[PDB]
Write a protein that binds this DNA or RNA. Structure first.
Ligand SMILES: [Ca+2]
Length: 313
DNA sequence: GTAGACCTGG
DNA sequence: CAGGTCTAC
């Protein structure tokens, strides 16, 4: 009975396991729907379900605990090894209290604004999902992006399991996305011109860059190196590259500059371009603005930016 | 080194 | 009308 549908902490207590984690270090309601990953849904109030480490999970938290439950057979509580995967996904080793202190210490503005928005951290995402999810972010809003990514995974990703009327799918592989007629197919799913970038980048990686390995090892390369490489892919400009660097390649100093960030820079810092004579967003002015926040916040400027983006809603 | 074109739900 | 990327003078 309760053995069907998405679980909740109450309905199947013996199936959940917890990870010590204070809400000051993580607010699911601030991270999961914030445009880092687009594959988490709050199917039950305060409960988020999505694919993590190739399996489906539901997560919910109390004041000091991050409660997790996994759907693989034979119903059972998450093993310690599995829970680890959750910890790594949320990079729980990176201490938020420490980062907030540092940023608050060097930025009076961050100071005030951050008090009301604690728990905003960066998800450690898979390079492929992050690469194609953000290729779909172009001239698009979170709601539409979520739909496109969803249709995309349903059509080309492996079927995992079914909860209620939701069939979860793993993210498509490079082979799948590189397949014949993927573009036309993606266009039917509404991805528009982005359909072409998805197809083109899948093939470029597989047939020109050396495949998945080329991408995966960027995590060991330098931020400037990683950012440089990523920009080779079609549909991947400096902005989506920074997103990938920050979100999947362990480059915490990466700062994706979009119009949103410009608004923050102008309104909350009275910032203006020093180098370029261009007064608005341009390849040159965007690069600079990114440098501005890096010198202000430090080695984790990217994480700091996420905090401001949350409080800005 | 700065404009329209690219797609389409609103 | 709306998060960028791409390419033409
Ligand atoms: Ca490119």
């Amino acid at each position: 009975g309760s053995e069907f549908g998405h679980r909740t902490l109450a309905s199947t207590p013996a199936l959940w396991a917890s990870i010590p984690c204070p809400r000051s270090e993580l607010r699911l309601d601030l991270v999961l729907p914030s445009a880092q990953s687009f594959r988490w849904r709050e199917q039950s109030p305060a409960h988020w379900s999505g694919v993590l480490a190739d399996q489906v999970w539901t997560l919910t938290q109390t004041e000091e605990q991050l409660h997790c439950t996994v759907y693989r057979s034979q119903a059972s509580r998450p093993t310690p090894d599995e829970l680890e995967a959750v910890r790594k996904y949320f990079q729980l080793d990176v201490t938020l209290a420490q980062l907030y202190h540092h940023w608050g210490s060097v930025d009076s503005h961050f100071q005030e604004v951050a008090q009301k928005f604690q728990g905003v951290r960066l998800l450690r995402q898979d390079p492929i999902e992050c690469l194609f999810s953000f290729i779909c972010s172009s001239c698009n809003n979170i709601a539409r992006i979520t739909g496109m990514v969803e249709r995309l995974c349903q059509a080309f990703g492996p079927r995992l399991i079914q909860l209620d009327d939701v069939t979860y799918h793993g993210f498509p592989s490079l082979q799948a996305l590189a397949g014949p007629e993927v573009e036309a197919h993606l266009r039917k799913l509404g991805l528009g011109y982005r359909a072409r970038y998805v197809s083109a980048s899948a093939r470029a990686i597989l047939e020109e860059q050396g495949g998945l390995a080329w991408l995966q090892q960027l995590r060991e390369s330098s931020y400037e190196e990683a950012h440089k490489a990523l920009c080779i892919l079609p549909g991947v400009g400096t902005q989506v590259a920074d997103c990938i660097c920050l979100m999947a390649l362990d480059k915490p100093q990466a700062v994706p500059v979009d119009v949103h960030m410009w608004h923050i820079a102008q309104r909350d810092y009275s910032w203006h371009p020093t180098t370029s004579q261009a007064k608005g967003p341009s390849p040159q002015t965007n690069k600079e603005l990114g440098n501005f926040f890096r010198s202000l916040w430090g080695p984790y400027a990217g994480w700091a930016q996420a905090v401001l983006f949350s409080a800005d809603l």
